[PDB]
Every structure is written in structure tokens, then in C-alpha cells.
Ligand binder design. Sequence first.
Ligand SMILES: CO[C@H]1O[C@H](CO)[C@@H](O)[C@H](O)[C@@H]1O
Ligand SMILES: [Ca+2]
Length: 147
Amino acid sequence: ALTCVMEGKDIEDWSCCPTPWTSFQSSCYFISTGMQSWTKSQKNCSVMGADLVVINTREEQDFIIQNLKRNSSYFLGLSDPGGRRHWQWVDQTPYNENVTFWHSGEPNNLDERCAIINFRSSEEWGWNDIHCHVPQKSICKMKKIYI
Ligand SMILES: CO[C@H]1O[C@H](CO)[C@@H](O)[C@H](O)[C@@H]1O
Ligand SMILES: [Ca+2]
């Protein structure tokens, strides 16, 4: 089943997500609470027709964090596979340093080549580079369906 809501006041503009997903602007988001490596997480998002989350704006991040638990860490679709700080998003969209939300002092390791979002005291939610093989929860994102 799909969950559909109206965009603006236009009674014909209904956009939808599968029911276990949440919606914000033109995208659907799914929180995957199983612990898996970054690559297995991206594969899992791919199976449900999506990708690991790509964060475009502060507004988007502020929405996503409403659906996360402050004691948990979640993979983003953000990685540096060659260890050169040449960050990649999984949907081949640009990496814009001035719209990133790294915690203070992050990213801090060339050998930590995947990114997570989590909560740190006082700094609240932000990003950390970590080892890709360490199992974590993840966030998947895809476009809404219009009917
Ligand atoms: C707890 O946070 C610290 O350790 C992790 C790895 O566990 C690093 O990614 C992070 O930058 C800090 O140095
Ligand atoms: Ca780090």
C-alpha cells in the first residue's frame, strides 16, 4: 500500500511512499534498524528500490533526525573509497563542502572511508567518518511516487 499526501493546496498533486516509509518534500525515507556494513546497507537500500540517504540541505537533515534515535548511528550514502578525501554520494550528485554537517573535528581519518550520522553531546546531530566494515543502522532514500 501507498501513503499519499497533498502537495500544497493543489487537490491533484498527491505524492506517495510505501507505508513503512516517511515523507519529506519530494522524497521517501526508510530507517533500516538492522546492523550491516556500508556496502551491505547500500545493497539493502537498492533491493527496496532506493539508495543510502543523500543529504542536500539542512532542512532535509532536520527532517531526517526526527525519525532517528539519539543513541544510534546511521550510515549515509557518503564515502571516500580511495582515502583521498574525495567524497562521493551514492547517487552521483555533487559533494558540496559548505552544505555538510560533520561534527567538530570530523572527518578525521583517511582510513575511515564511510560516513554516519549520529548524536554527540551539545553538538547534537552531525556526521562522522567511520570504518565501512563496522555494522550500523542505515537510512534509505528514494523519490516519491505520484498517482
Ligand atoms: C568515538 O569517536 C571517536 O572514535 C571514532 C571511531 O570509533 C572516530 O570515528 C571518531 O572520529 C572519534 O575519534
Ligand atoms: Ca571519524
